[PDB]
């Protein structure tokens, strides 16, 4: 029961993490807090000009934030609660 939540901004991931943790704990999941997981970022160095001026460039950043949540106790009530969770698209839940 390993919930892999990955998002682009922590500002949204924090609310989803708090909500899932609360929903799981209320029944007895014995779930550990949101486990901070290392981020993965990819850079895209790009020429800012059209034709000339190779030296001029612009760098855009890819940032992805993900955190793990593990549930120990079966407590199928927790699974039922998890099944009915509706959150924004930035979470991309994956068990």
């Amino acid at each position: 029961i390993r919930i892999r939540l990955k998002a682009y901004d922590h500002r949204i991931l924090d609310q989803s993490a708090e909500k899932i943790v609360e929903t799981a704990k209320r029944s007895g999941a014995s779930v550990s807090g949101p486990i901070p997981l290392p981020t993965e970022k990819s850079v895209y160095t790009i020429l800012r000009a059209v034709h000339k001026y190779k030296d001029s460039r612009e760098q855009f950043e890819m940032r992805t934030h993900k955190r793990l949540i593990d549930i120990v106790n079966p407590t199928p009530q927790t699974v039922d609660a998890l099944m009915r969770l509706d959150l924004p698209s930035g979470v991309d839940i994956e068990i």
Partner: protein, 206 residues
């Protein structure tokens, strides 16, 4: 080599994304689909003065939010418009599409709407010297700590083009907390193509 688009700079800090979804193995497909959707809806509602459109993917489900400033026209009879829109969007995408509409209070503060109005006025043969100051005063009366307009291209004078600037108030494009709405619009006229750049300063957040 001059100022960068403020919108492209404030993103990730204060301004929110105009698109939100984690794409698994289909990021390019989702991107192109949403680009096609935006182009379609823009060329369809151009007569409705639409400013922006955000989209969210909900696992084979699409949610759309439209900021119109005049939804009465976008809804029309209610079922007619929503159908003509959602049926076509589902046909293009092939999956479920859901639509939502939001009204805009004080439409004079939206960059895209003001830019489109100025482009229409210019295409309507209205004098820029008037339109610029008129829109500036309208925005200032609608509530804004700073506004600025730009008009460049063949204004009908001669084979020598120029760019005009009109503004008032504080417009600190360098301040990283300004929440400035910058929008560009094009106006294809009989003498050529004109470009309008309008960035509006509504206020900062502490």
């Amino acid at each position: 080599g001059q100022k960068v688009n403020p919108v492209g700079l404030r993103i990730g800090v204060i301004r929110d994304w105009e698109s939100k979804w984690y794409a698994g193995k289909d990021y390019a497909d989702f991107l192109h689909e949403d680009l096609k959707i935006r182009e379609y809806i823009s060329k369809r509602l151009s007569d409705a003065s639409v400013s922006k459109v955000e989209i969210e993917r909900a696992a084979n489900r699409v949610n759309i939010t439209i900021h119109t400033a005049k939804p009465g026209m976008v809804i029309g009879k209610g079922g007619s418009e929503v159908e003509a829109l959602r049926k076509a969007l589902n046909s293009l995408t092939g999956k479920r599409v859901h639509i939502n509409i939001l009204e805009i209070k004080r439409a004079d503060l939206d960059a895209q709407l003001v830019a489109d109005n100025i482009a229409r006025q210019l295409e309507n043969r209205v004098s820029f010297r008037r339109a610029q100051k008129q829109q500036i005063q309208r925005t200032m009366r609608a509530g804004a700590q700073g506004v600025k307009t730009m008009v460049s291209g063949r204004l009908g004078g001669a084979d020598i083009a120029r760019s005009e600037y009109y503004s008032e108030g504080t417009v600190p494009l360098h301040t990283l907390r300004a929440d400035i709405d910058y929008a560009t619009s094009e106006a294809d006229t009989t003498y050529g193509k004109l470009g309008v750049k309008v960035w509006i300063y509504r206020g900062e957040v502490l």
